Symmetry: C2
Subunit: 620 residues, 2 copies
């Protein structure tokens, strides 16, 4: 355990402070008297005294017999309860010889015990057998521990509910603190990443929580106002980034400043270590809570369809004065509160997130060092791949090909995503698309069996097979885009005409290969097999040299639990029904999913429930 040396003198008594539970090694400054053969030790009640050979572990009570003198023996003193008054306990070491009855000499040590401890919620409910916890460490995993700090605003009232509580216990005689001081401190590095408010009055006044640790404040002398304990409120100010691993440490040090002719000296130090909760993305397989549609007027059809879908799913709907391309809705999590946090990047000014999104919403942003769209960013369901477990899924980044002059995801955003460390990113090939969003060829829907989900991929090959099957069944003259309402630039085309267009078929073969590259990347990096993948029939055309959807992109869907909002494809009408819609239904309805095809020919984002898996139980 912890040990501290206190020296005593044969010539005069000594006074010292011992922290409750800390072992005090007591020894004299000079030499024992000549002729010393034996020694005895005594303590007042409440003072535990042990002896131990300095080369052996373990100890035994020392106050019950006369010992043979041996310089290699150590005298250990422990007090477990704080003193009521200064120097209310003492220890005496008496050195003896067999020739005279009185001690040759003796040393007296007066003792004042204080109980000093700096503690936070270590989140050790059932994780690491409390009291065998190194308070200087933060340990990941299902057998770890450590305090958690939430950051609800990072641009680089009664907000106390989001802060983390830090308690300083200072039991002891008040007069001691006339010559001893408690210093709460943190490094300047950590200081510019978090701040601390000390409550100096009732819990109802807003100006009683005084800012004691902050940017330039790296140390603070604690006044003992509220008797035996002082409460502090820690507020995180920065998410983990390329230069910040997320750990924040606070220390308290008891300093002996009684010697006016000497300098101050430390007697005891305690430490609390927080980890900033990372920003976590939510895949489309998590249950929805609120759907956000942002920028459309004169588009009551879209709003009404999204509202009907949300009512069928059971989640609320909110309209705000785009939200899916310049914003991503994640969350931060602590044992005491879960906060949704929006990551913003407007391809500006201070965004009012507490009113547009909600009162319990956080905000994080990153300015470039010199993102195109958050459609370049998705995240997978929980997966296992290459022996490594990813209980919060993996972020999916659609970047640009090596050697290209343009960049889709700036370096600062990639650094932020990797610094969250809980959703290790996977790079995808999207340069073949005209826009280049991951959702244009990829989607995740919940499923009752297998891995609990299916990965949907746009597939020109599946559409080839569907059209060949329909042609063999005598429906080759069925017309695509027949269900559209007679527009001047919407010309119908038959299954035969599509299958006979060599340029279109060859281009869709190329697009299928482009998607196959990502298919194998995802199978390797998400540990997926073919039975986890559903190929959605989807054709593409060339917005010259880049791909765009031939008919509305079926996989670019809105997933609200088991209810799907799917763009209406306007495919070939066979027996008065769209065979593309029928194929999608035959593929997805067996999974218990409900398909709603919405007429699509401006942005939608969903706030979802967090993962059931707690991020601090992960081992990255």
């Amino acid at each position: 355990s912890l040990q501290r040396i206190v020296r005593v003198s044969l010539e005069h008594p000594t006074s010292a402070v011992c922290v409750a539970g800390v072992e005090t090694l007591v020894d004299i400054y000079g030499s024992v008297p000549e002729g010393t053969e034996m020694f005895e030790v005594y303590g007042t009640p409440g003072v535990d005294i042990y002896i131990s050979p300095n080369m052996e572990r373990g100890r035994e009570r020392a106050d019950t017999r006369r010992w043979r003198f041996d310089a290699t023996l150590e005298i250990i003193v422990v007090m477990n309860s704080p003193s009521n008054d200064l120097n209310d306990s003492h220890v005496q070491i008496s050195y003896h010889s067999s020739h005279e009855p009185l001690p040759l000499a003796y040393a007296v040590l007066y003792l004042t015990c204080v109980d000093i401890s700096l503690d936070c919620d270590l989140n050790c409910e059932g994780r690491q057998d409390r009291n065998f916890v190194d308070k200087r460490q933060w340990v990941w995993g299902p057998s770890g521990y450590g305090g958690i700090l939430l950051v609800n605003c990072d641009r680089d009232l009664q907000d106390l509910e989001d802060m983390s509580v830090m308690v300083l216990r200072t039991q002891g005689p008040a007069a001691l603190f006339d010559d001893h001081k408690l210093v709460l401190h943190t490094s300047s590095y950590d200081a510019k990443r978090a701040q601390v408010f000390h409550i100096c009055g009732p819990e109802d006044v807003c100006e009683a929580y005084r800012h004691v640790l902050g940017q330039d404040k790296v140390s603070y002398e604690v006044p003992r106002l509220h008797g035996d304990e002082e409460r502090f409120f820690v507020e995180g100010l920065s998410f983990p980034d390329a230069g910040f691993t997320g750990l924040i440490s606070f220390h308290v040090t008891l300093l002996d400043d009684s010697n006016e002719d000497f300098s101050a000296s430390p007697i005891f130090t305690d430490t609390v270590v927080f980890r900033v909760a990372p920003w976590i993305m939510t895949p489309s397989t998590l249950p929805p809570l609120e759907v956000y549609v942002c920028r459309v007027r004169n588009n009551t059809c879209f709003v009404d369809a999204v509202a009907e879908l949300a009512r069928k799913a059971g989640c609320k709907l909110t309209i705000c004065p785009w939200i899916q391309d310049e914003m991503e809705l994640g969350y931060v999590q602590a044992p005491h509160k879960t906060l949704p946090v929006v990551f913003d990047s407007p391809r500006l000014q201070d965004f009012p997130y507490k009113r547009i999104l909600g009162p319990d919403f956080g905000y994080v942003t990153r300015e470039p060092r010199d993102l195109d769209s958050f459609g370049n960013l998705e995240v997978s369901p929980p997966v296992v791949a290459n022996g490594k477990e990813y209980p919060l899924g993996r972020i999916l980044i659609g970047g640009n090909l090596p050697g290209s002059s343009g960049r889709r995801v700036t370096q600062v955003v990639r650094d932020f995503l990797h610094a969250q460390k809980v959703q290790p990113p996977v790079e995808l090939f999207v340069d073949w698309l005209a826009v280049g969003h991951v959702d244009e060829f990829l989607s995740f829907v919940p499923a009752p069996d297998g891995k609990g989900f299916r990965m949907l991929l746009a597939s020109p090959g599946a559409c080839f097979k569907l059209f060949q099957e329909k042609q063999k069944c005598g429906h080759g003259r069925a017309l695509l885009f027949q269900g559209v309402v007679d527009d001047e630039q919407v010309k119908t085309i038959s299954i035969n005409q599509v299958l006979s267009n060599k340029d279109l078929i060859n281009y869709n073969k190329f697009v299928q290969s482009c998607i196959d590259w990502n298919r194998e990347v995802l199978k390797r990096e998400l540990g997926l097999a073919e039975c986890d993948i559903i190929d959605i029939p989807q054709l593409f055309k060339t917005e010259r040299k880049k791909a765009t959807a031939f008919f509305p992109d079926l996989v670019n869907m809105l997933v609200l639990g088991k209810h799907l909002g799917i763009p209406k494809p306007f495919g070939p009408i066979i027996n008065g029904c769209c065979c593309l819609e029928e194929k999608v239904r035959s593929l997805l309805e067996p999974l218990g999913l409900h398909c709603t095809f919405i007429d699509d020919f401006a942005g939608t984002n969903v706030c979802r429930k967090p993962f059931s898996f707690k991020w601090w139980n992960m081992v990255p």
Copy 2:
């Protein structure tokens, strides 16, 4: 292993590129002909063809029988040797029914095999015998792997010996590279931490190594000049710091840009991962190679004594136009070269290190964000503490007390030291000293037994005991400072007069307690027992509330192997001999150490051999 999908067509042949050893999954775009019941696969010699159920692992040869058609079966194609000409191999898949003898249809795939690999020295002499080695990872420990990059200059010819070699093998038909391109690339983050030169000519010209990857250069199209392989030389530009963990990655990507009217697409990617070698401090227990004396004139005694000590130790001596307070001599290590590196902090201009220190010397510096002296920094021998092993020792940092207005070690230096990560630092209490250097109370000397060393601590208590013993033996009137040459303000003082000075004895008792704090810190953090510690008798006096040596500081010694240069203490002369020198000899000579007491009533730094333990085998 790695798998890539290549689609074929029943209507026309397909041409594709396969990387040697990579599994190619072959499947058609559309549907098989109606009536398909069976299939066969054939390949030209050198093309391995297997089948595998897509839900099962493992494979078996597919070209020896007629199979029943089953859509869940996968056809796997492997080529292990590069092609000599384009499309020199092919595979045919024929679909059959039992009714007609000819295939209902067939698909032809022409194949060109290329062998592409980006490789570095993975330092896999043993520990792994690479067959499960992820080239995208750098693994610590005695069973790890990964490239190592050396940095010989960090301010934030034939330099090929310090660079790391990276080889790109590109075997294949030349005509393929008329439509396919090799792109060597790295992230901008890594780009501004390292550079890469491509050799584009003979190995004797200095302008043939063209700068191909650098600060703004994140991608480079590789020309195949030297036939089957190209050589690149990687030079690290930044040590690990608070914002750089030390990993540098390079990738090569083969891009298909043959398909006109389409966009380029990736076919293969390979990766090399380097770790920058950290800066490592050398404790005084490591063997010396060269002693550096810097700044003194008119003191031939100091230079002559250091030269005699170095001659007895066997190490060179060098004088240069301070070196221990503003510079620290560590080293960086790779399997191919070990470089001593100076960390500089001039309490200026570009310091010429290759001439003042030596040709094989590196340089590191850190500007403050707004250290007092490198005497605030020491390092321990290898230790084991709290179950954790520290095979390169632990750095010792003498900082200021919490709440003090001054700082001894700036935050940038602490961040650098912690970011090296291989010598986890320990904080020590030095504010009680007038100067505040760790060496004023601490030293490490080699020892033949125990842990292989002894930690020496200045100890007023040991001097108390020595003087009490000498007084009891009748030598109380022996005079300190009798060996002085009768200079002004240098008054002799007897053992009795020292022991009878209550203020001096009390102040040295306080100093002993200040040292005891560090004694317990070091015992805990270095896993030391009392048998590892030697208390050197040392008295202190007060420079106005701060400690300075009463007589010359014995523990502030120069350790050259088993030869010790110890400041001459000028202690009490008993029987014509200094009893302090005699006590130090009785303490240290049994360890096989040779004590030379040097008149010290100028800076000295030592360049030492590196640790025998290789840093990459550590698990931090």
